[PDB]
Amino acid sequence: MINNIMHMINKYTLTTSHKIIGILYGYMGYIAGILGYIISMLIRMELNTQGLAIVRKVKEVTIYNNWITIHGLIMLFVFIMPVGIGFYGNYLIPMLIGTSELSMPRMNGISFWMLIVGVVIFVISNVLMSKPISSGWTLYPPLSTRDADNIGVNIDLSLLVVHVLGISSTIGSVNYITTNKYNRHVGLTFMNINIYNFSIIVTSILLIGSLPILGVAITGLLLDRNINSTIYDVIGDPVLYQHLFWFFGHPEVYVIILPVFGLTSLILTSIIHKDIFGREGMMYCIISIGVVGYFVWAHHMFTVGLDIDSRSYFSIATSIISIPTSVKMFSYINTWASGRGFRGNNSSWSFFSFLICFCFGGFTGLLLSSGSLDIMLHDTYFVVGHFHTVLSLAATFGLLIAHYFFLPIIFSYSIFESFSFYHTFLLLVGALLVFYPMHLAGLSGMARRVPEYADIFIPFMTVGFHGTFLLIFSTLTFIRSYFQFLSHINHSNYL
Amino acid sequence: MSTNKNVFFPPALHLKENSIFQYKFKNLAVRHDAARLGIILAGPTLFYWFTVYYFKGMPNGLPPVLLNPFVNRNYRGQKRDMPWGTDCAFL
Amino acid sequence: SAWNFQELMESRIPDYKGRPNRSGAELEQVKAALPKIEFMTSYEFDVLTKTRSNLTKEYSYQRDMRLKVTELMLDEAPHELEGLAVEGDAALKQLAELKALQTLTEYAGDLLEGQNQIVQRVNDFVDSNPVYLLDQPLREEARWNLLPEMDHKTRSLVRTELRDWLPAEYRQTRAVDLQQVAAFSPPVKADMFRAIEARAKDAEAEIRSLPPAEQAGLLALVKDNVAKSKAFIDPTYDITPEAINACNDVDALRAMAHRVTEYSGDARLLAIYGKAAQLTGDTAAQAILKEAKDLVF
Amino acid sequence: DSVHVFRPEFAQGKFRIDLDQPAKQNKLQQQIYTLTDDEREMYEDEPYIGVDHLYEAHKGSKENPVVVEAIGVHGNDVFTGCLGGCHKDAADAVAYYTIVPPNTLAVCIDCGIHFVARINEQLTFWPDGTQPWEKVDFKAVEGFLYKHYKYGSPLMI
Amino acid sequence: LHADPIFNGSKVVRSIQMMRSYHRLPVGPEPPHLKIRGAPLHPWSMYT
Amino acid sequence: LGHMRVGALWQSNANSRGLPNLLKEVMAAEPIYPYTHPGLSAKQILWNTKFNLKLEKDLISIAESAVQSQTVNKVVIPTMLTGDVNPKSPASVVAKDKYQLAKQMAEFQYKKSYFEKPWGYMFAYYCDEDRARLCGGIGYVGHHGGGDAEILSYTEYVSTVVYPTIFYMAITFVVSLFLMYYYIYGTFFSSTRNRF
Amino acid sequence: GTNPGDIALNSKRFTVGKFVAWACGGWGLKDWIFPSLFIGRGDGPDFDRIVKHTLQSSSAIEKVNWFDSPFACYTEWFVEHFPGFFDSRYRFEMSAKTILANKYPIKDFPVVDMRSWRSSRLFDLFEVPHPEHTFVFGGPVLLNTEAKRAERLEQEWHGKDGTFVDVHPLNVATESHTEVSVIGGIKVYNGVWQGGKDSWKRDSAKPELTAPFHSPIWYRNMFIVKNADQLVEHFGENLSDETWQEVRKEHLAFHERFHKDYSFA
Amino acid sequence: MILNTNINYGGRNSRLCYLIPLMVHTIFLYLAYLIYYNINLINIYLLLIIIIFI
Numbered sequence A: 001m002i003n004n005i006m007h008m009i010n011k012y013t014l015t016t017s018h019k020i021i022g023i024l025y026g027y028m029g030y031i032a033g034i035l036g037y038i039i040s041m042l043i044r045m046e047l048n049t050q051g052l053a054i055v056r057k058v059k060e061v062t063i064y065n066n067w068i069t070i071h072g073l074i075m076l077f078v079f080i081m082p083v084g085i086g087f088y089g090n091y092l093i094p095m096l097i098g099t100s101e102l103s104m105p106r107m108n109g110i111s112f113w114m115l116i117v118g119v120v121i122f123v124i125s126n127v128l129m130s131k132p133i134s135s136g137w138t139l140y141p142p143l144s145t146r147d148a149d150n151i152g153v154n155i156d157l158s159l160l161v162v163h164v165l166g167i168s169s170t171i172g173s174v175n176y177i178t179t180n181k182y183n184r185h186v187g188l189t190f191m192n193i194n195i196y197n198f199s200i201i202v203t204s205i206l207l208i209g210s211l212p213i214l215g216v217a218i219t220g221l222l223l224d225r226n227i228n229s230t231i232y233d234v235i236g237d238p239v240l241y242q243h244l245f246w247f248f249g250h251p252e253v254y255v256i257i258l259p260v261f262g263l264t265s266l267i268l269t270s271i272i273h274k275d276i277f278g279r280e281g282m283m284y285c286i287i288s289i290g291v292v293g294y295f296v297w298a299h300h301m302f303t304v305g306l307d308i309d310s311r312s313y314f315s316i317a318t319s320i321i322s323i324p325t326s327v328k329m330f331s332y333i334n335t336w337a338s339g340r341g342f343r344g345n346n347s348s349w350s351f352f353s354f355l356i357c358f359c360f361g362g363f364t365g366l367l368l369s370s371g372s373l374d375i376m377l378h379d380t381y382f383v384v385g386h387f388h389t390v391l392s393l394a395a396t397f398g399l400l401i402a403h404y405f406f407l408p409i410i411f412s413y414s415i416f417e418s419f420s421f422y423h424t425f426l427l428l429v430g431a432l433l434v435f436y437p438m439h440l441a442g443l444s445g446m447a448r449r450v451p452e453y454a455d456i457f458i459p460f461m462t463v464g465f466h467g468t469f470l471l472i473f474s475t476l477t478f479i480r481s482y483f484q485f486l487s488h489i490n491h492s493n494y495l
Numbered sequence B: 001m002s003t004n005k006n007v008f009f010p011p012a013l014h015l016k017e018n019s020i021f022q023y024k025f026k027n028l029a030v031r032h033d034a035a036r037l038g039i040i041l042a043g044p045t046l047f048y049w050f051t052v053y054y055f056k057g058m059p060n061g062l063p064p065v066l067l068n069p070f071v072n073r074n075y076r077g078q079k080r081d082m083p084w085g086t087d088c089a090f091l
Numbered sequence C: 001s002a003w004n005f006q007e008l009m010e011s012r013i014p015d016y017k018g019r020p021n022r023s024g025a026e027l028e029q030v031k032a033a034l035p036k037i038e039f040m041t042s043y044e045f046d047v048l049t050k051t052r053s054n055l056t057k058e059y060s061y062q063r064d065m066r067l068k069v070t071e072l073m074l075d076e077a078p079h080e081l082e083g084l085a086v087e088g089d090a091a092l093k094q095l096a097e098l099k100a101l102q103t104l105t106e107y108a109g110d111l112l113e114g115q116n117q118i119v120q121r122v123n124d125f126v127d128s129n130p131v132y133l134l135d136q137p138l139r140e141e142a143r144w145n146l147l148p149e150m151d152h153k154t155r156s157l158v159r160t161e162l163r164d165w166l167p168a169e170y171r172q173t174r175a176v177d178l179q180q181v182a183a184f185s186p187p188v189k190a191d192m193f194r195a196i197e198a199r200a201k202d203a204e205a206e207i208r209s210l211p212p213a214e215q216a217g218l219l220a221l222v223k224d225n226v227a228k229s230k231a232f233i234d235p236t237y238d239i240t241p242e243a244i245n246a247c248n249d250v251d252a253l254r255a256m257a258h259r260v261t262e263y264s265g266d267a268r269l270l271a272i273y274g275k276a277a278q279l280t281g282d283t284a285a286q287a288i289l290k291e292a293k294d295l296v297f
Numbered sequence D: 001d002s003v004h005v006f007r008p009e010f011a012q013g014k015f016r017i018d019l020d021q022p023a024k025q026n027k028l029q030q031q032i033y034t035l036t037d038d039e040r041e042m043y044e045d046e047p048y049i050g051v052d053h054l055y056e057a058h059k060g061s062k063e064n065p066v067v068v069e070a071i072g073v074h075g076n077d078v079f080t081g082c083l084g085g086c087h088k089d090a091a092d093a094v095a096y097y098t099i100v101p102p103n104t105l106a107v108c109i110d111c112g113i114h115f116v117a118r119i120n121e122q123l124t125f126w127p128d129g130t131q132p133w134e135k136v137d138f139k140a141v142e143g144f145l146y147k148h149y150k151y152g153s154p155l156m157i
Numbered sequence E: 001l002h003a004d005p006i007f008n009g010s011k012v013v014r015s016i017q018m019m020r021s022y023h024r025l026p027v028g029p030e031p032p033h034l035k036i037r038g039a040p041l042h043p044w045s046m047y048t
Numbered sequence F: 001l002g003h004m005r006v007g008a009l010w011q012s013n014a015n016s017r018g019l020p021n022l023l024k025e026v027m028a029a030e031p032i033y034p035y036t037h038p039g040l041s042a043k044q045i046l047w048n049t050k051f052n053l054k055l056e057k058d059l060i061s062i063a064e065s066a067v068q069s070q071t072v073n074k075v076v077i078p079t080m081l082t083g084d085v086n087p088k089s090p091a092s093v094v095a096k097d098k099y100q101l102a103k104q105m106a107e108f109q110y111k112k113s114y115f116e117k118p119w120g121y122m123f124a125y126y127c128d129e130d131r132a133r134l135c136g137g138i139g140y141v142g143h144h145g146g147g148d149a150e151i152l153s154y155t156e157y158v159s160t161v162v163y164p165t166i167f168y169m170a171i172t173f174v175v176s177l178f179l180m181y182y183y184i185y186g187t188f189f190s191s192t193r194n195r196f
Numbered sequence G: 001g002t003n004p005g006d007i008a009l010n011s012k013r014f015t016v017g018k019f020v021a022w023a024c025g026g027w028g029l030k031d032w033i034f035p036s037l038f039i040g041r042g043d044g045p046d047f048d049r050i051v052k053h054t055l056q057s058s059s060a061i062e063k064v065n066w067f068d069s070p071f072a073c074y075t076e077w078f079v080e081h082f083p084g085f086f087d088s089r090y091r092f093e094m095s096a097k098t099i100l101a102n103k104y105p106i107k108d109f110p111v112v113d114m115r116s117w118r119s120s121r122l123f124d125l126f127e128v129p130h131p132e133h134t135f136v137f138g139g140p141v142l143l144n145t146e147a148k149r150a151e152r153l154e155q156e157w158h159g160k161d162g163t164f165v166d167v168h169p170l171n172v173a174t175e176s177h178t179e180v181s182v183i184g185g186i187k188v189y190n191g192v193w194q195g196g197k198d199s200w201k202r203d204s205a206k207p208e209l210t211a212p213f214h215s216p217i218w219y220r221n222m223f224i225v226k227n228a229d230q231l232v233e234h235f236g237e238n239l240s241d242e243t244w245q246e247v248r249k250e251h252l253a254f255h256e257r258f259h260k261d262y263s264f265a
Numbered sequence H: 001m002i003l004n005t006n007i008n009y010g011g012r013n014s015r016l017c018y019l020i021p022l023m024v025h026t027i028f029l030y031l032a033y034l035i036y037y038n039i040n041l042i043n044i045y046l047l048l049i050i051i052i053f054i
């Protein structure tokens, strides 16, 4: 069986087939999602109970800070992008334009294995090693360079993880654009390719333009830590670091969101048995959102001390970006109308949840755009409510739509609809209980990244406790459903 | 039939010029590229060397910059251990 | 110039110009040179080039293959239909024989389809590599142009040469139309009818050399086959001048005129229409018929 | 007076396949473009040519179907497609695709159009420089075609 | 009496086993989706 | 090496599935000659086949010899526009006079009795068979659609559904604006109550 | 769509499979303690419903050749999940027989299988799981490539004259035709041998070798492709719209006694 | 003869699909080691030889 073992290992390591690379991306994405979920459960158990019930010492809150930073990094860079872009991007993009492979078949494998290298370095650095990085997912200096709890090498290893993930994303983006531009079959124009391909193209354009800046910022951090320069010191510009990082920061956000829009549009065409209402309108709105996302980066720094004119300008630009997303939401609402979507499909109900949650998250985030009103809401739990009721309820539910639509196709076994209904509904109700209270705890002044809070905020954390229990139930249901998916019967008798 | 024939035994073409090289310099684009190269070679290069000929026996009177004041000789007590091992510049 | 994003060929947009401009001199010279031209109504061309008997427009070699396979299958029928045994009356035995025959024909049918597919694949190869099957100067015109875009003369020469590249039994030429040739020539129709009668008589003798019940069955079959063969070669062999003269019904003459027009549209039209006009007193019709028999026929 | 010889293109394989018969391979790979909204407006008001569509059988009749030739393996199903809207009740938002047996008469009953897919394989001489430079006869071709039809031939991947 | 296989051979069956368009909705003459109290569920309903 | 296939003959693999033989699927174990050759036994069928085959050979030979040795008195060359490969079809598929209308009507009645209704019934059975195939928990049959589904044209749907929906939405918009402003500030036009 | 496998080794109360299911997913104490609610009726063939549907059928069960077809092994699944199965099958088979017994020389039989469904996205046309290598020999070919292009707009976009697009020189020559025939002393030129697109008619059909030359019989299987979302069918010359509506009404009137006593809930 | 496929590049399996990622991993762990112990794990010239060779 030596030949069989080596053949399997060569199949899954030397491959360049887009289907195999896609399934590998999907697997890694799901695994990292589960890991991030476990860390999130740890964080929630820390918050729910009073008196540092888990760390037991103020000196050891660095464990909680490490938890939040790795939760953020794992869930952003290894859960959504590998799944939303890596998995369906590789599996479907060549098929939807009628071609064999992506351009540059080898660079696809290089991308996946760069992702795996990054995951390995991150997992070893932040688990097997002591006193890990604990500076929040936005590695602000001088906290991430000139501190006492961040001195080990594993911090530098985490920065290099960021580097490798950036390299992987750039390679993937270039490959997607190139394949979609020249390999289309005869008779298919550039703007007639289906909606998903276009969203992937614009996402790839976003990633290409911003990642080098993030690389520059991370190299700055590494140089400050190692060769002892002063780019981001008391005689440096931590605000310069913030500008660069957040110039990358928002394009990453729209990169995350747009492929979910593409997938939802495609699946809708497949399940409502009708075309997209205003397909050209949706494509133009997607490209508009892509372009406008490059001019709004500094709405994450309204309290840094920006010039008053710049504050006004960035509030204006954020509203501008808000417009076309509203156009898209209306287009979705009208698309579902007149259609014959399945009345008992987890895909349908997950689409509903995606639409509602994205509208609510977009509104809450449009409140935060105003510079003046961002005085009272910066670094409170209102921001956490915002980007969790978008990321964890609109991006997650879009991926659930894709998951429940493409499992039968990929594997050829139908879906246990009642099981999936329990999972999706308990995920909806539990998540709402966790994040919705955060909103009213942000207007009340509760800061974020705190393991211990004042007694004024108990009710919100009690509702969060309820939500966390429901979330545990939902995720166990999900994993057990998937295990049941690929397992043959266990009982059989005669009636 | 296959073009391989002309791959194997390509035709030989008669030129009036003594060589192919000259024939390619009757095209405006190549002439303009040669003009750019000549402009760069003639003006700057010849001028630059002329200057080191014209100022061969004269000093550099530029005022040196001021980097590190005496009261800041400790650099605020900041760790400066480079990755090589010793607190010295790679150079 | 530092980038080159070309393709194999730029898309070719046709220039239209228009119909030729000829002055009085050129038009006069063209008119003088041309022969005597009889402009034909589209109906004449239609009746000339209809598909009548060769229903599926099969090539000559396809028909030859089918007839040969039929001969082989007939040769092997007695072996398969020999020794059949099944519990039941005469009807069950008959249906068992029918099923055995069906199995044999299906077996022989699948071989014919295989051979047709093989020959069609050889031809597909012929058109797939015309550059390697042509001599100068047609090779360059095959290389640089597709079939629709070629010059008419070069197009025809290229196609004829490619077809001639094949052996004799692979060339694709439409099979003959028996009904067509019969319709457009009297002697061939008479010869075909004489051959039908001769074969029928020979088969009738063969039948007379058989036991009784087979005699009656096969005589009925021979009569039906003769009738349907005569109908197949020419559906209007009963529209004779004698029949037209014996006919005194306007509706019947109209129906006969329709059936003749459908088939060949020959002088029987003149006879039928003349008699119809006489029964109706149509001087204009008679004048037009005189013109027709002067010019059309 | 000098003799100049241009450097030829030595590449073989797919490059020589595409340079031997550029019209056919261009036809395979060349893009063609649909109409924008302005052109749709300017086209739907174009007039017919003569009174012929009133009498003749349209392109797509059971006697005059639309014939489309693809490449592949003999017997493999053919991917074809309409661009939508052939009949006024057929959607035209995006192209609609079909998979149909190789050499059978098929009917799009959304549009009622009769079509005929057909696969013609691209059997070509091995591109290693031993290609025939002058008209070749049926003998060697006969042998190669026999071997292919019996056992099959590799793919140019 | 068995010939070489061909794709249009006499012994080729319809493809009803292997699924191709999984997410279609069958369309044609179909019964009204009547709803009754207590009657056995119809085979062609979402409820079983 | 396992079970290596010999010869590249046709196998029903994923890419190629072949053309179904509906005649054999329907007429399974039942002969076709009772319908195509009514009232004939196998021996009669074979005898008739041989007789007709010889007759057809004779006729084909005569026709080929005739076309091969006939003098040419007229040359027919159809008119086609340059850049056209074949001439247009002279034939037409539309009845012109009333007699052709009657002929077409008779043919259509026969075809309806013998060709079109069988097609309709076969297609109905096919639709129902597909519905049964996608039933039992395998596909999404019965989730939506049916004979009770209300299908509206574009004009009817826009006029009777979309516009009233937007009208009600506009009413809701104005009413909610006014009631929310009064709910918070306490006055319809004076901002906060008891403060200004 | 499930084969239970070996009923014997899965009916035991305690099994390695059941313990593994409990550990990882699919089984638990709720199944041992409460089997009425969590196993319930279970999934399998329904003898009672099969018997009811069989006894509701008319004599069409006797006269149908279903049991000898290759699909006889699916008899119970269809009898249970296709109310009024035998009557519909009998009508289908009689339709085929009456097509076979026509007077026309070509018998077209409709064929509808899983491939008869069009889709706007290409991944919906492959068998699942998808083949490893797809579109090796290029992507789909569009029927529109055989339609005349928009000559007017094509000329306009390029700024060319485009005045005489609809008027062309007449071509009446003997060098423009390759298919020459002789018909009763008249030499007719007509057509040009184009290639495999001129042989579609014969390759689409298969002859009846025993049919006499004076009454040919050809079998043709016409493939049917439908969108499955259109809700309106246009068959062309095969089936007129009025006839199709009549057939709709007749089918829904006769097949209403096998659908009336069931509820869709 | 040879059956001709589409015009795309079919794609070959190659060892570069993991060698380049392993090279990046090696460079980054080498830098971490140099940062921690102030001495290279292996000679820089040997590392560059490996990188060039791959």
Ligand code: HEA
Pocket: A030, A033, A034, A037, A040, A041, A043, A044, A047, A068, A069, A071, A072, A073, A075, A076, A079, A080, A083, A136, A137, A138, A384, A388, A391, A392, A396, A399, A400, A403, A427, A431, A434, A448, A449, A450, A471, A475, A478
């Ligand atoms: C995509 C990104 C993502 C996702 C999915 C999540 C998921 C969750 N997050 Fe978090 N979170 C962040 C991004 C994300 N988060 C970021 C960027 C920060 C800031 C870090 C920092 O502030 O520095 C943050 C910070 C953050 C905090 C900050 C605490 C503090 O700052 O005071 C808390 C605590 O309440 C929290 C809770 C949760 C919970 C309870 C879940 C989930 O339990 C709820 C939803 C759970 C799901 C079930 C998703 C799990 C996915 C799987 C189940 C895979 C299965 C497959 C698919 C369905 C595709 N998150």
Ligand code: HEA
Pocket: A138, A253, A254, A256, A257, A299, A300, A301, A302, A318, A319, A321, A322, A323, A325, A326, A327, A329, A330, A358, A359, A361, A362, A363, A365, A366, A367, A368, A369, A370, A374, A377, A378, A379, A383, A386, A387, A390, A391
């Ligand atoms: C995950 C995806 C995602 C998406 C889509 C968005 C969308 C938006 N986000 Fe945000 N955001 C994040 C992810 C996302 N965000 C994350 C992860 C953070 C935290 C980073 C961190 O600090 O760690 C963050 C943080 C963040 C802040 C930080 C506040 C603070 O830190 O000071 C702000 C404030 O400007 C902001 C604004 C917006 C706006 C204005 C939109 C708009 O795009 C929303 C537009 C949506 C709509 C408008 C809905 C459509 C509405 C209608 C249907 C019609 C109504 C329209 C009008 C009346 C005009 N986001």
Ligand SMILES: CCCCCCCCCCCCCCCCCC(=O)OC[C@H](COP(=O)(O)OCCN)OC(=O)CCCCCCCCCCCCCCCCC
Pocket: A227, B088, B089, B090, B091
């Ligand atoms: C093969 C391609 C490159 C591969 C790079 C691999 C390493 C990645 C790490 C990136 C950045 C590393 C920075 C560390 C280098 C520190 C250099 C230094 O000490 O600078 C001082 C020197 C000038 O000294 P000065 O005081 O002016 O001299 C007095 C009299 N002349 O100034 C200098 O020497 C400046 C040198 C340029 C600035 C660094 C930018 C990267 C270029 C690589 C240089 C060598 C990197 C050595 C790293 C060792 C580990 C691999």
Ligand SMILES: [Cu+2]
Pocket: A249, A250, A253, A296, A297, A299, A300
């Ligand atoms: Cu932002």
Ligand SMILES: [Zn+2]
Pocket: D082, D086, D090, D108, D110, D111, D112, D113
């Ligand atoms: Zn169509």
